[PDB]
Amino acid sequence: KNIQVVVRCRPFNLAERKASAHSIVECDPVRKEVSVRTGGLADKSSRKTYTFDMVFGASTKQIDVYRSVVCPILDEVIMGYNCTIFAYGQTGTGKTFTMEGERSPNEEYTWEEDPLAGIIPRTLHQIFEKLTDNGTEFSVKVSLLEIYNEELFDLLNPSSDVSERLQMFDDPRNKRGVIIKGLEEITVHNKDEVYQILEKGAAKRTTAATLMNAYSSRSHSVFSVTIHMKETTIDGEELVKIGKLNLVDLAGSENQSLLTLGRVITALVERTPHVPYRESKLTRILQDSLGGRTRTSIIATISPASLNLEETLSTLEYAHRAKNILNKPEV
């Protein structure tokens, strides 16, 4: 089962518009193609075109990404599978906008109806809508860690100092798994507890950014939600499903974890014997998502601007080749 790769192009921002930026990206959602204009002033006709599993153009809204991509993934998680979605792309292209979102100003929407909310809050909101009172006895727990300079910080930890570090070990019970020693896993009892948790998480990250150089662009963010489901069959049997969803917002593609991820992906695509998972914190964490039994999706984010031609091409090639990686989703 191949890793699914989608592309999301953001709209122009104000600074690009003030610089009279030209578009070099055309997205065709129906053909699922992205075509980029590569020849600038010299060669008006040259393009590079790629087919992906889905393509989202500049007008795609947060809700569109959720309906197209996330909903199907979540339903699989609820069936008791493990799934991973990660965002890959240049700093400034919308990785964080996509994975987390933002709050619209003034207080003019609830967090659950905010059009700027991204994948994490919609996912948590939906977990509760989908399972609450639908018979399922169920629990939800969340964690949020960040990797920076191969050190591990805990955004949800009750410790008031964000710099207190985690430690990673192999998990003796799960052959591709790790244990994040010290990681705070918060039980979310109902959706009315969701916002405050995320909010405190974001406030610790804000502090971290004042502490460490180029923090948000160099950091990888790893959000995980685990759903324990217990049901009761008409026969009398008690049956337990456990689903886990990893939501990952990588460092800007433009560095050991980012570097090792590339080497890991390259080794998977070229079927080379040794896959260097152990050489970074990120790839140890993602081992099961990258040639394990976790179902993995990639969202490659790009800018439409001519200025960014080179990184836009690099992102598309990187993402396109990852469509060849096969996982064995199973639970």
Next chain:
Amino acid sequence: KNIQVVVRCRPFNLAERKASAHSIVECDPVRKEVSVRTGGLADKSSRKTYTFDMVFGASTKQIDVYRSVVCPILDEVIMGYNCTIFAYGQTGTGKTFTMEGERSPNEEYTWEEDPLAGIIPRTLHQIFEKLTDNGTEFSVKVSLLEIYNEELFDLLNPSSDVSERLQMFDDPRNKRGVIIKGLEEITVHNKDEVYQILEKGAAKRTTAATLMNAYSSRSHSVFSVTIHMKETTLVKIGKLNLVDLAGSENQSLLTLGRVITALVERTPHVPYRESKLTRILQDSLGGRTRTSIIATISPASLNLEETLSTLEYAHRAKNILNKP
């Protein structure tokens, strides 16, 4: 004939004066010498002294540079020769001031009379003065591209996005020439069309500085004027490249140094092809083009090592033969 090399030292700026900066540079126009005080507090007798084709001290005004250096060169160009002037030196020493200049404030002067105007505007002006007054039919075309990170941008292009990139290909009908694919070459019908053209180019550069890290200090700027003169007994074509190099303090600058060394040592394979700048400049160097270098320096003690680096770098270039 040898590549001509001159030196221009700028006056102290206000931050230097506030830092109580001492001069370590003495320029002697008559001996054509630059003498640098090198011993600091330790040895008051140490100097490095260099002889150049011309030396311009702190008090030199834009018009002196134009009259002394460019007038003779522009004569050559009008006679159908190709010429190239490039400024080399540390960021902050006056490479752009010299090649382009600046606008005095409050519209005090027309652009033709502005004391701060540099080589490019004075040249375009004088081309029209000299030839209009000549009688012969002539046309004038200009282009302005910049090299940043080995990418080529067109400052005069009608395209509204300065980031749209040019490409470079070998010129099939010239062994040392290149064609800049996409390059806007604007016909200048009258000197009253000059300022707006340069003005828009500069506005596009301003946008570019905004988009790319340390743009103006790392960019090389290539301004070219071409004059077609209909003579009988004929078309005479004169081309003048006016080049404002990246700060000397990076593939193109790197390769230029290697090219210059290879030309100095008289080695076989000058690596012109290993950077955009040297491919563009190939024909200039060890081509028929007559080349002048204007080496720019600061007078301040603080900048000692870079000042010596510039002087040494430029001085050796005097031994290179043009061949035009």
Next chain:
Amino acid sequence: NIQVVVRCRPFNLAERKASAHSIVECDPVRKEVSVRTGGLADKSSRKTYTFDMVFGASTKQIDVYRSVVCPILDEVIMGYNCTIFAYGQTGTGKTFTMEGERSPNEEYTWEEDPLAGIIPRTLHQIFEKLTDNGTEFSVKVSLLEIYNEELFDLLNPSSDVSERLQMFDDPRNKRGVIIKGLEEITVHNKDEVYQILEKGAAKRTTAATLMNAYSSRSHSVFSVTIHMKETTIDGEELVKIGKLNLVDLAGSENNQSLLTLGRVITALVERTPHVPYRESKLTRILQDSLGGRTRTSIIATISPASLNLEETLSTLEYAHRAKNILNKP
């Protein structure tokens, strides 16, 4: 042998803003520094170091002076060459320790100012100890800085702080060098001290304006030389000369003089035959006063904050490698 002490500064505003946790516990009595090393993963992990002395966040400037400098100033007065270094990451209190700071307004005189560091106190005390002692004596000072292996003279009459010194072997002293161009100012009485220091600090301020990350990369070498005369019953003279070098090193975080100094301390300490003095401007300058004949002290400054774990451990390992003291029980 080398004396090694550790000084931990107090939390600063930004660290409190960011709710910083301490990972450093200092015990002056036991001369121990205990570092909390396990963050979130292991609450019980601790690394413990033992030094000649340990000063905690509350330690006053004058106490650092009394306990560290005085014994050393006595040796100098007896005509020997001594050096005191401050070592540690930028921001931990090296310059605070070596020079101190000037309390706002003028609530105290420089001699009384509780923020004054080792340099001003040392000068003040030299005159006290010798001015009521008897003896005829002479005091001169120099303050130079090493930046990118370039040498700048902070007390020089030259108005341009960028005029560079040069360094040569002292033909009459194989372990010494001549700092060509160096301004040695005679300080006649204590009422001349402050303006000299103040002119030097003003030169440095200008330098930091000229050169990238100047104060964090520079080594600062302040030198006091004392000439002391005594006549014999027959009118012959015997001068004894003492020298004190107060050295505020470049930040240890993550240049050439810095690594060389390390190799020289390492070589002096594990006692290797050839000491690498020649290799840097800093160790050539200080060779005279190093070797073990004379008292040498390193004040390793650290931060208490969790954020700085790795650099604090690194500073501590450095200090520990300079004089290995074993933990007690």
